[model samples]
Target chain A: KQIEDKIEEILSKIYHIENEIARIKKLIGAIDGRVTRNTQSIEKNSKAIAANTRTLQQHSARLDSQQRQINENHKEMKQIEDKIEEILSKIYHIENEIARIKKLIKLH
Target chain B: KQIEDKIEEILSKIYHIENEIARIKKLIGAIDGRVTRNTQSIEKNSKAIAANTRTLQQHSARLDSQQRQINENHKEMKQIEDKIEEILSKIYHIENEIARIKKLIKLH
Candidate 1:
């Protein structure tokens, strides 16, 4: 967030981004429960996926801690991905400003 | 990044994303010098921007530590922005699978 000079928009984006990260942290922390509880449904879903594959053979494989962790990590990654996109969007604005100035002064 | 079953693609993304962040961290760490060295250019750039505005009168302001820190943070945010983008791209693959499974089972 802003450097706490304490009134500019710099920290504002940081504050927002940090807050978003905090939310993701909490969500990532809880992903175990969500995936753990939904293991059965996810398995069913997995089967559904397998069914759509070329080999319609359903294997006896069950959801293990490994897959559970994968799901958890997946969710975490998704959350981080989203926050970063927002960061990118903001940066894009600044880049546009830079380009605008460069174009104005022929800094190329 | 893969979760380190230690052989999946999950931690791979995390590892890469983290590595990118480390690079960004170093770059962000060095943004002060980059911007500081180019303050004259940035100031001139700013004047150029102001010139493009309604009031072409150039203001008599200088780049203080405040703006330096802002530029530093901006670079940091931009770095983070890139890492997260790679993350989002990875997540999209998993999401497509989910959607595929959902459609197969008519779970909509």
Candidate 2:
């Protein structure tokens, strides 16, 4: 009976770990969606700038906006990379914890 | 034996440094101009959002403003990056100046 209780405890902890991993995974996925949207906006702005650059040189509304858009895109890419790193690290730690919990259950 | 030659050599070094600094200054100026134009566009975007946020006051405003800050941050980052680029060029020149001068003397 004591062994069974130990197993249940380990299993519950594993369940919570999995839940957290799943939630973070979803957040990462959402971040990617937003990042893609920003990329699209960047492309549109680039096209506009290219089209207007000759007519108005660098001062064109389109060109001005394009510079800002490209800079924003770069920042967005960095943010996405940061989120990926975070999710990967969290998953790695959770996996290690799960392994430790499993070993404890077996010892019991 | 040739003190005048030494004076001319030192003067050459100073002249080269001034010329190199001038080139980097121009590059930095160009980059700053682009960065400033980008900044203006960001202000336009900020105003547009403010207008939209007043009427569309909800998730749409939240969604738009969330990303608008991204461009503002990048526009500022670019200005800083240009100054960094300027210093980087001259610093590299300073590091290589003696080698370049020696090479020129060897050919002469």
Candidate 3:
């Protein structure tokens, strides 16, 4: 009876260890899934960041060029305004001379 | 003796399983560390992405406003050009009339 009891106890311990192994395996599987999911997420985010950065750079370049062109247009407009002012001054003098001539003709 | 051997074999099996459990625990710890590191990296990236998005929005708004101003400048430039042309036409007619007046005075 003692020997049989000892055999039973050993068998029970083996059974318990087998159950533990099964539980550990299950835990490992879950951990593996989580790691893979996280790794994939990391990769995705990295790619998105890179793509966004490139787009930002392109937009920045475009804005700079457009601003430069606008500045050039502003300079040209300023020059045109100066030319117009100069021409108006000349017209004013010409009109004054014409008035003087008209007054002299009337006096004659 | 046979029962003793059986118990010994079972004890060895239990020992092996305990070792396996230890190894699994170590693996879980390593995996836990990776998960923690990955989570931290993910959080950092998320913030970076959000900041970049806000910057992108601001830049886009600025670009839109600048472009609109440029268009306005172009329209103003067109109007100025038309005004200049009109002034040039008036100058041409006035000069021609002046020359005719001088010729008549000489003939007299």
Candidate 4:
């Protein structure tokens, strides 16, 4: 009777240990699955962000190029305006000079 | 003398309480001022962030449009490259054919 009781106790302990191991394994599996899933999501989001960054960079470059071109055009326009003013002033001065010369010739 | 002393104590206690109350009120005002400043700062920051968000959104939209343009440019460039390659290949093939024809003519 004593031996049979001891055997039953041992068997119950064995079953309990097996159940504990299985529970631990299940918990570990759940954690592993979560980690794997999170890793994959991180990878996917990172890839998408990288691609978006590249696209953003290209667009920014284009905007910079356009801004530079417009600035150059502005400079060109300013130069033209300055030249026009200079030409008009020179023409006015020449007209005065010619008028002075014509009056001197008439006086002579 | 005891009554005078009592009166003096009472007055002092009243003064102390009033001082304490005033100090507390000042503290509260300081806190209120800090809170108000922080709130205004938050509002200003919110407006700035909103403006930045709008600029970013505009950039994103421009990026999208430019992506399509770049795609078209790529396609056009690829087509041009292919045409050039085809022309070069046809020239080579024609040269080879001409050589073969010349050889045949010489043989005949």
Best by TM-score: 3
Candidate 2 lDDT over residue span A1-108, tens digit each: 655564565566556656655665665566566556655655665565455444344234544565677776787668656655665665566566556655655675
User: Which pairs, if any, clash in model 4?
Assistant: none
Q: Cα-based RMSD of the predictions, in order? A: 45.1, 52.1, 2.8, 28.6
- Runs in model 3 lying further than 4 Å from the true structure: A2-10, A54-58, A102-108
lDDT string for model 1 (A8-80, tens) is 4443645565565556556544654554455445456445544433221121122233345555655665576
Best by DockQ: 3
Question: True-contact fraction for model 1?
Answer: 0.00
Q: Considering only chain B, report the TM-score of each candidate against the true chain B.
A: 0.32, 0.47, 0.96, 0.73
Chain A TM-score from candidate 1: 0.33
Listed models, DockQ each? 0.01, 0.01, 0.53, 0.01
Q: Which stretches of candidate 2 lie over 4 Å from their true place?
A: A57-108, B1-108
Native contacts matched by each model? 0.00, 0.00, 0.54, 0.02
Best by lDDT: 3
Which residue pairs show collisions in model 2?
Answer: none
Q: How well is candidate 2 docked (DockQ)?
A: 0.01
Q: Can you give the TM-score per candidate against the true fold? A: 0.20, 0.27, 0.82, 0.45
